[PDB]
């Protein structure tokens, strides 16, 4: 359900600069409640990923297309991890006799 | 210059003859490929048969 | 009654093949295969040759069409009609293999052997060739003892693994939508029902 | 095996060899292949989609299994003449799929999520990549290199066993039952090698048993044939084959195994069981 | 004269390359003819057998 909700965040383009903005964070709140995480931290990481440029940390900027691509990659990685966990659980259940 | 140009005509004429012979000689092995492949195809099918 | 009805899509009545007179008539008629634009390969009678070619007539329509000698292929006698093993065909060629595959598919036989690997054709319909009775029938049966079936290949692989003590691998190759998933499903079902 | 065992046999060239395309795809050394070029361009200094396509066209341009997409690049960038047919590929978003970048902040947040399932899913985060403007404990492997390692381990395992190939054919692309497409079936039997796979079994010797294994498994057929005592394994099988009255064109004696045509062991197995039938009962 | 001689050298080089190509192409026909005769010779006894 969380993977399904991911992507509904309609990012808007700022009129001043080229920065992503989430005017309606309902989908973000739903995804955070489903996956079990915070909403403010998730929004700050999606719109301002904290990464070091070589020395200290800096809040890098993200555009609408970049934010959409990041959301898609996150959903893909989540689905891949879920499939891997399911396969591992199936293998463990099948390899539990001798 | 006529001697050098004259020799160029022989070389050019020979080159043109080689081109005409090349296209003619090329068809010899090219057309032979059809008969060669035909014989091979008939021989391959004959070998299998 | 389920097994009796499923046997129709497995065994082939060989009583309608034993006929030396029919084979002699076919040999005297001299029939061969030829390329087609709507049926892969169609039958045709061989006539007098003309150089590197020979005129032939289509058994369906009967039109005298010229066909190259390289495109003609020999036809198998009536004895090799819906054979159980493709390796037993006398005139082995593309046309004969295609005709045998078509005859086996239209007759309700998607499985067909071929030397050491079996061939399968997607029927696109749930066939009655999958049941507990059929699985029990194929239990402990050689490859040349039952009609072509994935259960037969699975049993042969299991027997080889138990005898030679060497591992096996039921590999399935084919284009998307050929039936590899169903073949693997049936192999796993047979292994779980037999090797339990 | 025929050449190693030393037997009368001629080399038959079937022509089926997809080594060129497999090399063009995976071959890392020598001329960089498709996967090798994508891995080399996996970095993000100046490479893009158009630059990667140009590099591929400049490198693997003269390869026989490489052509342009129709007249113009309307819906594809290049083609690869595979064993089945020509496929039109589009080099769009390929670098991202090969790198598979992920947000480090969101990854760490999911790893430390309150939910137990989400924490177990993202328990392994040391293999995530997400940098911008070479080894790293071998964790900087792309999706292409990771798939090659997984496939290499798979192909190496199947070679150690006895593969039982089961070829699957499709009648048509319309999902219609009972409608067989001869044009589509003919194209599959050619690339699949069904015809070439049957001639090798008929003309060759798919059956072969070791000298020692052939004795104990077939001595009941001709008990009074070998001298009751010690005898060489190779010479012992010669006396058994002679007693069985087998044609010379139905077996080939090598240096360690005894080959047989397609259908010889099937007859001996039935005769062997019939001989011991009175004992088993 | 020097420029005209250069054209003869270039023309002679072209005819020379054509002669080399003709020799290679002729060798193909000679080899194909020899191989073609082998298939024709191998098909005689093949059909007889
Ligand atoms: N041997 C078979 N018998 C009956 N139906 C089949 C068989 N093989 C495939 N099908 C049908 O074809 C459909 C698609 O099969 P698919 O899963 O694409 O096969 P694969 O995984 O080998 O491509 C399925 O819905 C299935 O019902």
UniProtKB/Swiss-Prot annotation, chain A:
It is found in: Cytoplasm, Cytoskeleton; Cytoplasm, Cell cortex; Cytoplasmic vesicle, Secretory vesicle, Cortical granule; Cell membrane. In the kidney, expressed in the glomeruli. Also expressed in leukocytes. ISGylated. Disulfide bonds: none annotated. The modification N6-acetyllysine is found at residue 92. Myosin is a hexameric protein that consists of 2 heavy chain subunits (MHC), 2 alkali light chain subunits (MLC) and 2 regulatory light chain subunits (MLC-2). Interacts with RASIP1. Interacts with DDR1. Interacts with PDLIM2. Interacts with SVIL. Interacts with HTRA3. Interacts with Myo7a. Interacts with CFAP95. Interacts with LIMCH1; independently of the integration of MYH9 into the myosin complex. Interacts with RAB3A. Interacts with ZBED4. Interacts with S100A4; this interaction increases cell motility. (Microbial infection) Interacts with herpes simplex virus 1/HHV-1 envelope glycoprotein B. The rodlike tail sequence is highly repetitive, showing cycles of a 28-residue repeat pattern composed of 4 heptapeptides, characteristic for alpha-helical coiled coils. Cellular myosin that appears to play a role in cytokinesis, cell shape, and specialized functions such as secretion and capping. Required for cortical actin clearance prior to oocyte exocytosis. Promotes cell motility in conjunction with S100A4. During cell spreading, plays an important role in cytoskeleton reorganization, focal contact formation (in the margins but not the central part of spreading cells), and lamellipodial retraction; this function is mechanically antagonized by MYH10. (Microbial infection) Acts as a receptor for herpes simplex virus 1/HHV-1 envelope glycoprotein B. Belongs to the TRAFAC class myosin-kinesin ATPase superfamily. Myosin family. It is linked to Macrothrombocytopenia and granulocyte inclusions with or without nephritis or sensorineural hearing loss: An autosomal dominant disorder characterized by thrombocytopenia, giant platelets and Dohle body-like inclusions in peripheral blood leukocytes with variable ultrastructural appearance. Some affected individuals lack leukocyte inclusion bodies on classic staining of peripheral blood smears. Alport syndrome-like features of nephritis, hearing loss, and eye abnormalities are present in some patients. This is Myosin-9. It comes from Homo sapiens. The gene is MYH9. The chain holds residues 344 to 441 of 1960 of the full protein.
């Amino acid at each position: 359900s969380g993977v399904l909700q991911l992507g509904n965040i309609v990012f808007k383009k700022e009129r001043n600069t080229d920065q992503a903005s989430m005017p309606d964070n309902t989908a973000a709140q739903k995804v955070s409640h489903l996956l079990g995480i915070n909403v403010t931290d998730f929004t700050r990481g999606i719109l301002t990923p904290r990464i070091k440029v070589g020395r200290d940390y800096v809040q890098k900027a993200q555009t609408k297309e970049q934010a959409d691509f990041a959301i898609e990659a996150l959903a893909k990685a989540t689905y891949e991890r879920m499939f891997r966990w399911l396969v591992l659980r199936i293998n463990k259940a099948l390899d539990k006799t001798k | 210059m006529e001697d050098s140009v004259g020799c160029l005509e022989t070389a050019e004429e020979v080159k043109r003859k080689l081109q005409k012979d090349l296209e003619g000689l090329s068809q010899r092995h090219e057309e032979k490929v059809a008969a060669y492949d035909k014989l091979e195809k008939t021989k391959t099918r004959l070998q299998q048969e | 009654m389920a097994q009796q009805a499923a046997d129709k899509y497995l065994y082939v009545d060989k009583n309608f093949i034993n006929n030396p007179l029919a084979q002699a008539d076919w040999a005297a008629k001299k029939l061969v295969w030829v390329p087609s634009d709507k049926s892969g390969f169609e039958p045709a009678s061989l006539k007098e040759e003309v150089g590197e070619e020979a005129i032939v007539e289509l058994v369906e329509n009967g039109k005298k069409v010229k066909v190259n000698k390289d495109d003609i292929q020999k036809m198998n006698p009536p004895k090799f009609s819906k054979v159980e093993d493709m390796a037993e065909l006398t005139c082995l060629n593309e046309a004969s293999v295609l005709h045998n595959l078509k005859e086996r598919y239209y007759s309700g036989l998607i499985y067909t052997y071929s030397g050491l690997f079996c061939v399968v054709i997607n029927p696109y319909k749930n066939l009655p060739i999958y049941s507990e009775e059929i699985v029990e029938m194929y239990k402990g049966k050689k490859r040349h003892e039952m009609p072509p079936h994935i259960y037969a290949i699975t049993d042969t692989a299991y027997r080889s693994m138990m005898q030679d003590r060497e591992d096996q691998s039921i590999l399935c190759t084919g284009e998307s939508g050929a039936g590899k998933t169903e073949n693997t499903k049936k192999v796993i079902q047979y292994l779980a029902y037999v090797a339990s | 095996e025929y050449q190693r065992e030393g037997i009368e046999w001629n080399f038959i060239d079937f022509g089926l060899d997809l080594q060129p395309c497999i090399d063009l795809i995976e071959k890392p050394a020598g001329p960089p292949g498709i996967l090798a070029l994508l891995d080399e361009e996996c970095w993000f200094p100046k490479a893009t989609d158009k630059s990667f396509v140009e590099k591929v066209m400049q490198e693997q341009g003269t390869h026989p299994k490489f052509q342009k997409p129709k007249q113009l690049k309307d819906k594809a960038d290049f083609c690869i003449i595979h064993y089945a047919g020509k496929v039109d590929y589009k080099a769009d978003e390929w670098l991202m799929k090969n790198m598979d970048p992920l947000n480090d902040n969101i990854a760490t947040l999911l790893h430390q999520s309150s939910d137990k399932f989400v924490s177990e899913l993202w328990k392994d985060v040391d293999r995530i990549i997400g940098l911008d403007q070479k080894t790293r404990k071998g964790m900087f492997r792309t999706v292409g290199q990771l798939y090659k390692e997984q496939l290499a381990k798979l192909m190496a395992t199947l070679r150690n066993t006895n593969p039982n190939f089961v070829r699957c054919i499709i009648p048509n692309h319309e999902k219609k039952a009972g409608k067989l497409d001869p044009h589509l079936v003919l194209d599959q039997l050619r690339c699949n090698g069904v015809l070439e796979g049957i001639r090798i079994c008929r003309q060759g010797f798919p059956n072969r048993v070791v000298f020692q294994e052939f004795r104990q498994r077939y001595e009941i057929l001709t008990p009074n044939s070998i001298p009751k005592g010690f005898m060489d394994g190779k010479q012992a099988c010669v006396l058994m084959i002679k007693a069985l009255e087998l044609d010379s064109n139905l077996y080939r004696i090598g240096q360690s195994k005894v080959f047989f045509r397609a259908g010889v062991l099937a007859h001996l197995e039935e005769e062997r069981d019939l001989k011991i039938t009175d004992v088993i009962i």
